[PDB]
């Protein structure tokens, strides 16, 4: 229609439907005024977001020690990059969409208008496709940004897409064409679900306290942004060698007998038999007898002797293998040298020697979790319990500089390393040198075979374990803390002085402590934080500063003179330092409310002057103009961070709060107002129905492509290879152009 | 308030066996090691061994390996040391000492009052 | 098999500083010997003073310190009191056993 309803503030330009030239004259005024307001809103919403940054940031005082007597004192602010902090920043930039929907309903006598709901659905398309496409491209070439936290991304992105699906449900599925009171409130009450999940995710899903911390300079004067990062000649027969060597776990030892000399075209018979030395048959090795036949043309024959494995520590032991009874079928063959081989068995059943890698270690306070390796040296036999604890030194830590930890490390069989995780508290100190200690106690062998328990003379209680090791049942020692059935437990419990010697060697293989049993941990300041503060001090009455900054290279002159009216006007906003950011917060949200009252009028009168629908002018123009604050917030996090969580999450967080507060509050107020009059609140579903389904179909394509860029050929959601970088960006811009073109046609009934 | 209280003075004949007790109170008995130490006049002191009552793990010196047997009764929070085949050298004073299990800390924190054993006929 | 050797006795006056020596037969006392210093009062009262060559037991007076001097462990008493008259033993940790010293009969005049 060509008839314009009177706005909240702006009067109707009269007379209506004047001519064709006057429509061009009037619409040019409305378009330029609306674009100038969009320029103003981006300036004030930037300052509104910076005030939110100060409210949610802790203020720290930095002492800067110097070799001279004078030491300068500086105060900074650390803004933690959490999901709970980012969902408030996504809330701050969505104030133009949220306020416009509420103002339009309440301003126009609680009647559903096309401009507000469409600029929220149309903002989702601009946010999901255009902003994400730009974040893919701004990452420098050769660098990727990957979503580290994919469980959180799935839950949040589903909730944002469901927000627009749920909007379809209340308009078309449940009581179509009418919004009920419970429908309006339930839309609003999904917003606290976003808030609680953000708090839950920081506590348990992310463990933000214990991630590696990185610091970057914020956009404000003294703000420092802290985020997550990645934590840094007749024939004769004789043995080949004459002395063979083997481990105990070899299974069999290989001996090579050689017939050499004489004539090969003959048959040679030789007998072999093992004889006990230091190692005894049936206990350390398998007794073996046999006869070796040398065929014509055959020179060497391998024989194999079984080596019996066990669990008990022993010294190096040896046994003898002899050759005898050389014979020839049908002198010619004799017994050569060496005629006897000595096989020496190396034991490997030492339970271990436990030590630290180095005696002194240096960690930064931003490490989060530090992992200290405890090494097991010269043997890894049996299960060994190694107690450990933390000792306070200069770092008095009970949550102050670190978290006290103690316990027992259980080294399994054939396991040679385990780690100790100590939680180091980050305090944002410019200069720090604190010391605490980590010590390991006497190791105890808690799991062994039955015969080893005889040799170690263990007098405790054992429960038989289902595990088997070297063909014997494995027994585990009962601790006092454990309460067993007491029928399950077994007490395994004049020696010949050879068995006494067997016990003495067996105790030589019990677990002991190594060179470094105490670790000194020196907590130091972060190099990244120290360098960040050093960046600040190089380049860093406040009422007066804003007005001097308001008025100040040809391209810069164009932008300066365009926005000089806005910068001077918004220099009357209180400085963010007053009332801990709240003085700036109250005044900024009032001005945002004022300029989106004008935008609602300027967009309304622009459409009806040229016949453009409020659905079309909200999707194309108002949706793009109010997402300028969201675009710069995502772009900075895409480049300056290390991951893509904050950049993509700002898009997802914006999309959710647009529906839940922008439409939830506006339709709650309208439905309640009509219910007090005993009347229904009627919203025409047809315009919004096709828009929200077109978004969700296009959103799954966007989410699908983002998940497809996780392959190692691409490497991450953002950045990546340059040829794939353009294709992802051009596809997502194509999805937005397809959305706004199809939505415009459906508005005009062109299907 | 850690206290280790031992049994009284004991006289035993040569070639016999004897059991000595040390009741520990004021701390968690099963989570700490117990040191057993021997004192003779003019021969300094000799470390007999140690026992961990939680697992009943033991440490001994080669000389006292067969001579002394270290046991625990965690229900009554008592540690026992049994000497077998007594001789004239065994007349001494025996002590129990608390150890936390870590070598950086003191290995002989709290001592018992000492039990004197006399082996004579 | 090692033998730990100490001086037979030490004699000091109240308020002075005394140093007690723990020597190892096999060589130089290291931090892997974990030198312990314990105290025997009259009538068989034993107290553990220092363990781990440096660490001092809670409740021990602050005048007792342990250190490594040269090739031997040392107990330093700064401002010795009249109540410090006792017999001091040093225990050194070898691979699998503790060896105790002879015991210094430290006496303080009164
Ligand atoms: C069912 C819940 O629905 C919700 C839907 C959207 C929501 O908004 C946001 C979600 C994620 C955000 O960043 C993710 C992120 C950032 C980071 F720095 C480190 C790790 C991260 F995973 C930011 C805003 C919220 N809060 C809830
Ligand atoms: Ca409905
Ligand atoms: Ca063997
Ligand atoms: Ca053997
Ligand atoms: Ca073996
Ligand atoms: Ca073996
Ligand atoms: Ca922090
Ligand atoms: Na936003
Ligand atoms: Na916005
Ligand atoms: Na928008």
In three-state form (DSSP H/G/I as H, E/B as E, the rest C), the secondary structure along A545-610 is: HHHHHHCCCHHHHHHHHHHHHHHHHHHHCCCCCHHHHHHHHHHHHHHHHHHHHHHHHHHHHHHHHH
Residues A34 and A157 in one domain: yes
For B43, name the nearest residue in chain C, comparing CA atoms only.
C102
How distant is the Cα of A415 from the closest Cα of chain B, in angstroms?
22
Best of A649, A659, A661, A703 for a ligand 1 pocket test (most atoms within 8 Å of beta carbon): A649
Is A163 in contact with A127 (CB distance < 8 Å)? Answer: no
CB crowding A4-38: b at 16 or more within 10 Å, else e: beebeebeeeeeeeeeeeeeeebbeebbebbebbb
Q: Ligand 6 mean position to A311 CA, how many Å?
A: 5
- Token pair listed for A707: 């998940």
**Separation between Cα atoms, residue B27 and residue A551, nearest integer Å:** 74
Asked whether residue A27 is domain-assigned, the answer is yes
| Interface contact flag, B55 A481, Cβ < 8 Å | no
- Token pair listed for A156: 């949040």
Is residue A732 helix, strand or coil? helix
**Separation between Cα atoms, residue A351 and residue A410, nearest integer Å:** 12
| Strand-pair category, C72-78 with C64-69 | antiparallel
Residues A622 and A729 in one domain: yes
Asked whether residue A366 is domain-assigned, the answer is yes
The end-to-end CA distance of chain A, in Å, is 20
**Separation between Cα atoms, residue A495 and residue A75, nearest integer Å:** 78
**Assigned CATH for B3-119:** 2.60.40.10
Choose the final residue of a domain: A346, A373, A398: A346
Q: Ligand 10 mean position to A611 CA, how many Å?
A: 22
Q: At what angle do helices A150-168 and A181-200 cross, to 10 degrees?
A: 170
Tell me which residue has tokens 């271990």.
A352
Tell me which residue has tokens 């005009």.
A748
Is B72 in contact with B79 (CB distance < 8 Å)? Answer: yes
Which residues have a Cβ under 8 Å from the Cβ of B84 and sit 6 or more positions away? B17, B66, B67, B69
**Separation between Cα atoms, residue A386 and residue A511, nearest integer Å:** 9
Choose the final residue of a domain: A326, A346, A366: A346
Query: Which ligand sits closest to the CA of A176?
Result: 2
**B108 reaches C (C-beta below 8 A):** yes
Asked whether residue A228 is domain-assigned, the answer is no
Query: Which ligand sits closest to the CA of A160?
Result: 1
Residue A603 burial (10 A CB sphere; 0-12, 13-18, 19+): buried
Q: Ligand 3 mean position to A466 CA, how many Å?
A: 24
Residues with CB under 5 A from ligand 9 (ion): A 93-94, 96, 626, 629
**Separation between Cα atoms, residue A652 and residue A655, nearest integer Å:** 5
Task: Give A426's DSSP letter.
Answer: P
Is residue A79 helix, strand or coil? strand
Residues A342 and A242 in one domain: yes
Instruction: Return the residue in C30, C32, C34, C97 with the most chain A beta carbons within 10 A, the one to mutate for interface testing.
Output: C32
Instruction: Determine the Cα angle at A438 with ends A436 and A443, to 5°.
Output: 165
* C12 sits in which H/E element: strand C9-12
Q: A277 is in which domain, residue-wise?
A: 235-346
**Separation between Cα atoms, residue A364 and residue A349, nearest integer Å:** 39
Please tell me whether the peptide bond between A338 and the residue prior to it is cis, using omega within 30 degrees of 0. Answer: yes
CATH code of the domain containing A413: 2.60.40.2030
Is A255 in contact with A321 (CB distance < 8 Å)? Answer: yes
The end-to-end CA distance of chain B, in Å, is 40
Q: How many Å separate Cα A741 from the centre of its chain?
A: 39
Q: Ligand 3 mean position to A411 CA, how many Å?
A: 23
- Token pair listed for A304: 């194999």
DSSP E strand boundaries for A406-490: 406-411, 417-423, 433-440, 444-449, 462-469, 472-477, 489-490
**Separation between Cα atoms, residue A79 and residue A59, nearest integer Å:** 9
- Token pair listed for B89: 């050298």
Q: Which of B28, B40, B24 is nearest to B94 (CA)?
A: B40
- Token pair listed for A171: 């308009």
* A637 sits in which H/E element: helix A628-640
* Angstrom distances, CA of residue A80 to CA of A507, A704, C53: 55, 30, 45
- Token pair listed for A489: 């437990």
Is A101 in contact with A663 (CB distance < 8 Å)? Answer: yes
Virtual torsion, Cα C24, C26, C27, C32, nearest 10 deg: -70
**What technique solved it?**
cryo-EM
Q: Which of A221, A139, A124, A98 is nearest to A549 (CA)?
A: A221
3-state SS, one letter per residue, for A249-308: HHCEEEEEEEEECCCCCCCEEEEEEEECCCCCECCCECCCEEEEEECCCCCEEEEEEEEC
Helix, strand, coil content of chain A in percent (nearest 5):
45, 25, 30
**Separation between Cα atoms, residue A125 and residue A130, nearest integer Å:** 7
3-state SS, one letter per residue, for chain B: CCEEEECCCEEECCCCEEEEEEEEECCCHHHCEEEEEEECCCCCEEEEEEEECCCCEEEECCCCCCCEEEEEECCCCEEEEEEECCCHHHCEEEEEEEECCCCCCCCCCEECCCEEEEECC
CB crowding C66-104: b at 16 or more within 10 Å, else e: bebeeebbbbebeebeeebbbbbbbbbbeeebbbbbbbb
How distant is the Cα of A454 from the closest Cα of chain B, in angstroms?
14
**B93: which strand partners?**
B39, B116
Q: Is the Cα dihedral A354, A356, A359, A365 positive or negative?
A: negative
Task: Give A409's DSSP letter.
Answer: E
**Separation between Cα atoms, residue A90 and residue A265, nearest integer Å:** 93
C7: number of CA atoms within 13 Å, CB side? 14
How distant is the Cα of A132 from the closest Cα of chain C, in angstroms?
60
Q: Ligand 6 mean position to A347 CA, how many Å?
A: 6
Residues in chain C: 110
**B92: which strand partners?**
B117
- Token pair listed for A722: 């340059």
How distant is the Cα of B48 from the closest Cα of chain C, in angstroms?
9
Q: At what angle do helices A582-610 and A115-125 cross, to 10 degrees?
A: 100
Is A588 in contact with A96 (CB distance < 8 Å)? Answer: no
Chains adjacent to B (≥3 CB pairs closer than 8 angstroms): A, C
How distant is the Cα of A441 from the closest Cα of chain B, in angstroms?
4
Measured by CA distance, the residue closest to atom 6 of ligand 1 is A653
CATH of C4-108, one of 3.20.20.80, 3.30.930.10, 2.60.40.10, 2.40.128.30: 2.60.40.10
Asked whether residue A304 is domain-assigned, the answer is yes
**Separation between Cα atoms, residue A611 and residue A395, nearest integer Å:** 72
Tell me which residue has tokens 């802290």.
A226
For A439, name the nearest residue in chain C, comparing CA atoms only.
C52
Partners of B107 on chain C (C-beta within 8 Å) are 34, 36, 48, 51, 91, 93, 98
Residue A81, phi then psi, degrees to nearest 5: -90, 90
Asked whether residue A56 is domain-assigned, the answer is no
Atom of ligand 1 nearest to the CA of A156: 5
Task: Give A140's DSSP letter.
Answer: P
Is residue A488 helix, strand or coil? coil
Output A170-178 pairs: Cβ under 8 A, ≥24 positions apart: A171/A683, A171/A685, A171/A688, A171/A689, A172/A685, A172/A689, A176/A685, A177/A682, A177/A683, A177/A684, A177/A685, A178/A680, A178/A681, A178/A682, A178/A683
- Token pair listed for A673: 């107002």
Q: At what angle do helices A83-93 and A181-200 cross, to 10 degrees?
A: 140
Instruction: Determine the Cα angle at A353 with ends A347 and A359, to 5°.
Output: 150
The end-to-end CA distance of chain C, in Å, is 40
**C32 reaches A (C-beta below 8 A):** yes
| Interface contact flag, B45 C51, Cβ < 8 Å | no
A580 φ/ψ sector (left φ>0, alpha ψ -120 to 50, else beta) = left
- Token pair listed for A470: 């070297």
**Separation between Cα atoms, residue A191 and residue A313, nearest integer Å:** 66
Q: How many Å separate Cα A110 from the centre of its chain?
A: 45
* Angstrom distances, CA of residue B30 to CA of A443, A462, A507, B99, C48: 15, 17, 23, 12, 21
Q: Ligand 1 mean position to A293 CA, how many Å?
A: 79
Query: Which ligand sits closest to the CA of A654?
Result: 8
Residue C26, phi then psi, degrees to nearest 5: -70, -20
Is residue A67 helix, strand or coil? coil
Q: Is the Cα dihedral A529, A530, A532, A536 positive or negative?
A: positive
DSSP E strand boundaries for A470-517: 472-477, 489-490, 512-513
- Token pair listed for C17: 């500083």
Residues A255 and A391 in one domain: no
CB crowding A269-301: b at 16 or more within 10 Å, else e: ebebebebbebeeeebbeebeeebebeeeeeeb
**Separation between Cα atoms, residue A375 and residue A359, nearest integer Å:** 13
Which residues have a Cβ under 8 Å from the Cβ of A495 and sit 6 or more positions away? none
**Separation between Cα atoms, residue A552 and residue A569, nearest integer Å:** 15
Q: At what angle do helices A685-708 and A150-168 cross, to 10 degrees?
A: 160
Is C100 in contact with B39 (CB distance < 8 Å)? Answer: no
**Separation between Cα atoms, residue C72 and residue C95, nearest integer Å:** 18
**Separation between Cα atoms, residue A348 and residue A223, nearest integer Å:** 60
Is A634 in contact with A67 (CB distance < 8 Å)? Answer: no
Residues A665 and A516 in one domain: no
Choose the final residue of a domain: A476, A508, A524: A524
Partners of A445 on chain B (C-beta within 8 Å) are 57
| Interface contact flag, A480 B102, Cβ < 8 Å | no
- Token pair listed for A724: 């794939």
**Separation between Cα atoms, residue A574 and residue A112, nearest integer Å:** 36
| Interface contact flag, C51 B97, Cβ < 8 Å | no
Q: Which of A47, A41, A55 is nearest to A97 (CA)?
A: A41
Asked whether residue A4 is domain-assigned, the answer is no
**Separation between Cα atoms, residue C41 and residue C103, nearest integer Å:** 12
Asked whether residue A308 is domain-assigned, the answer is yes
**Separation between Cα atoms, residue A483 and residue A104, nearest integer Å:** 70
How many CB atoms neighbour CB A479 within 10 A? 20
Atom of ligand 1 nearest to the CA of A197: 2
Residue A237, phi then psi, degrees to nearest 5: -115, 130
- Token pair listed for A642: 């290390």
Asked whether residue A214 is domain-assigned, the answer is no
* A653 sits in which H/E element: helix A645-657
**C14 reaches B (C-beta below 8 A):** no
**Separation between Cα atoms, residue A301 and residue A294, nearest integer Å:** 8
Best of A652, A657, A661 for a ligand 1 pocket test (most atoms within 8 Å of beta carbon): A652
| Strand-pair category, A235-239 with A333-335 | parallel
A349 is in an annotated binding site: yes
**Separation between Cα atoms, residue A334 and residue A370, nearest integer Å:** 69
Residues with CB under 5 A from ligand 4 (ion): A 284, 314
In chain A, the number of structural domains is: 3
Residues A450 and A381 in one domain: yes
Q: At what angle do helices A664-676 and A95-107 cross, to 10 degrees?
A: 20
**Separation between Cα atoms, residue A712 and residue A704, nearest integer Å:** 16
Residue B29 burial (10 A CB sphere; 0-12, 13-18, 19+): buried
Q: Is the CB of A159 under 6 A from ligand 1?
A: yes
Q: How many Å separate Cα C104 from the centre of its chain?
A: 8
């Amino acid at each position: 229609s060509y008839y314009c309803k009177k706005g909240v503030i702006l009067p109707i330009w009269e007379p209506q439907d004047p001519s064709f030239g006057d429509k061009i004259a009037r619409a040019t005024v409305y378009f330029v005024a609306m674009v100038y307001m969009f320029l103003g809103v981006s300036i004030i919403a930037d300052r509104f977001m910076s005030s939110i940054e100060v409210i949610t940031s802790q203020e720290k005082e930095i002492t800067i020690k110097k070799p001279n007597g004078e030491t300068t004192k500086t105060t900074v602010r650390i803004w933690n990059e959490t999901v709970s902090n980012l969902t408030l920043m996504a809330l701050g930039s969505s104030a133009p969409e949220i306020l416009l929907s509420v103002i339009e309903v309440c301003g126009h006598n609680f009647t559903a208008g096309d401009l507000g709901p469409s600029t929220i659905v149309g903002s989702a398309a601009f946010n999901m496709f255009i902003i994400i496409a730009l974040c893919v491209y701004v990452v420098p070439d050769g660098e990727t940004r990957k979503i580290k936290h994919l469980r959180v991304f799935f839950v949040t992105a589903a909730w944002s897409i469901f927000a627009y699906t749920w909007l379809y449900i209340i308009l078309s599925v449940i009581s179509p064409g009418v919004v009920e009171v419970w429908e309006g409130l339930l839309t609003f009450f999904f917003f606290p679900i976003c808030v609680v999940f953000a708090w839950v995710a920081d506590r348990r899903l992310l463990f933000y306290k214990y991630v590696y911390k990185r610091y970057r300079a914020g956009k404000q004067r003294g703000m420092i942004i802290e985020h997550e990062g990645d934590r840094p000649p007749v024939s004769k027969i004789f043995f080949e060698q004459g002395t063979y060597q083997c481990l105990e776990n070899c299974g069999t030892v290989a001996l090579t007998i050689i017939r050499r000399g004489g004539d090969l075209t003959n048959t040679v018979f030789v007998d072999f038999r093992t004889e006990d030395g230091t190692a005894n048959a049936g206990s350390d090795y398998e007794f073996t007898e046999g006869t070796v036949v040398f065929k014509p043309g055959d020179t060497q024959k391998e024989i194999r002797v079984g080596i019996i494995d066990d669990d008990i520590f022993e010294e190096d032991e040896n046994f003898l293998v002899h050759l005898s009874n050389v014979k020839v079928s049908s002198t010619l063959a004799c017994l050569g040298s060496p005629s006897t081989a000595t096989v020496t068995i190396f034991d490997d059943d030492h339970a271990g020697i436990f030590t630290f890698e180095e005696p002194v270690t240096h960690v930064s306070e931003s490490i989060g979790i530090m992992e200290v390796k405890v090494l097991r040296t010269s043997g890894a036999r049996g299960n060994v319990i190694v107690p450990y604890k933390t000792i306070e030194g200069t770092a008095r830590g009970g949550g102050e500089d670190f978290e006290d930890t103690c316990g027992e490390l259980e080294f399994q069989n054939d396991e040679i390393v385990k780690t100790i995780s100590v939680k180091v508290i980050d305090d944002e100190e410019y200069e720090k040198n604190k010391t605490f200690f980590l010590e390991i106690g006497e190791p105890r062998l808690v799991e062994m075979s039955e015969k080893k328990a005889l040799l170690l003379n263990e007098l405790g209680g054992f429960t038989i374990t289902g595990k088997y090791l070297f063909g014997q049942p494995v027994f585990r020692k009962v601790h006092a803390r454990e309460h067993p059935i007491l029928s399950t437990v077994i007490t395994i419990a004049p020696l010949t002085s050879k068995e006494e010697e067997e016990r003495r060697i067996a105790e030589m293989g019990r677990p002991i402590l190594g060179e470094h049993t105490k670790l000194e941990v020196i907590i130091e300041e972060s190099y990244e934080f120290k360098s960040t503060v050093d960046k600040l001090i190089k380049k860093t009455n406040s009422w007066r500063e804003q007005f001097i900054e308001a008025i100040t290279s040809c391209f810069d002159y164009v932008m300066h003179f365009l926005t000089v009216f806005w910068k001077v006007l918004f220099a009357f906003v209180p400085p963010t330092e007053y009332w801990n950011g709240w003085a700036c917060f109250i005044v900024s949200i009032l001005m945002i409310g004022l300029l989106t009252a004008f935008i609602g009028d300027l967009a309304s009168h622009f459409g009806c002057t040229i016949g453009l629908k409020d659905s079309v002018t909200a999707v194309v123009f108002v949706a793009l103009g109010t997402s300028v604050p969201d675009t710069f917030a995502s772009k900075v996090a895409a480049t300056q961070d290390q991951y893509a969580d904050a950049s993509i999450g700002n898009v997802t967080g914006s999309n959710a709060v647009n529906v839940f507060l922008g439409i939830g509050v506006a339709w709650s107020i309208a439905a309640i107002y009509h219910a007090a009059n005993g009347e229904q609140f009627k919203v025409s579903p047809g315009t919004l129905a096709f828009s929200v389904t077109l978004f969700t179909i296009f959103a799954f394509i966007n989410v699908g492509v983002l998940l497809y860029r996780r392959r190692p050929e691409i490497g991450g959601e953002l950045g990546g290879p340059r040829t794939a970088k353009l294709l992802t960006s051009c596809l997502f811009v194509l999805l937005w152009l397809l959305y706004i073109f199809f939505s415009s046609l459906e508005a005009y009934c062109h299907i | 308030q850690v206290q280790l209280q031992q049994s009284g003075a004991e006289l035993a004949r040569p070639g016999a066996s004897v059991k000595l007790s040390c009741k520990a109170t004021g701390y968690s008995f099963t989570s700490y090691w117990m040191q057993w130490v021997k004192q003779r006049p003019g021969q300094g002191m000799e470390w007999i061994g140690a026992i961990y009552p939680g697992d009943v793990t033991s440490r001994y010196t080669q000389k006292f390996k067969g001579k002394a047997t270290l046991t625990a009764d965690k229900s009554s929070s008592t540690a026992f040391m049994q000497l077998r085949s007594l001789a004239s050298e065994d007349s001494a004073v025996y002590y129990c000492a608390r150890w936390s299990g870590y070598y950086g800390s003191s290995s002989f924190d709290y001592w018992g009052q000492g039990t004197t054993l006399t082996v004579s006929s | 098999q090692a033998v730990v050797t100490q001086e037979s006795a030490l004699t000091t006056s109240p308020g002075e500083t005394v140093t007690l020596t723990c020597r190892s037969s096999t060589g130089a006392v290291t931090t892997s010997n974990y030198a312990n210093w314990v105290q025997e009062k009259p009538d068989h009262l034993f107290t553990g003073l220092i363990g781990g060559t440096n660490n001092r037991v809670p409740g021990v007076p602050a005048r007792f310190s342990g250190s490594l001097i040269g090739d031997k462990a040392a107990l330093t008493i700064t401002g010795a009191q009249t109540e410090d008259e006792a017999i001091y033993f040093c225990a050194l940790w070898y691979s699998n056993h503790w060896v105790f010293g002879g015991g210094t009969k430290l006496t303080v005049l009164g």
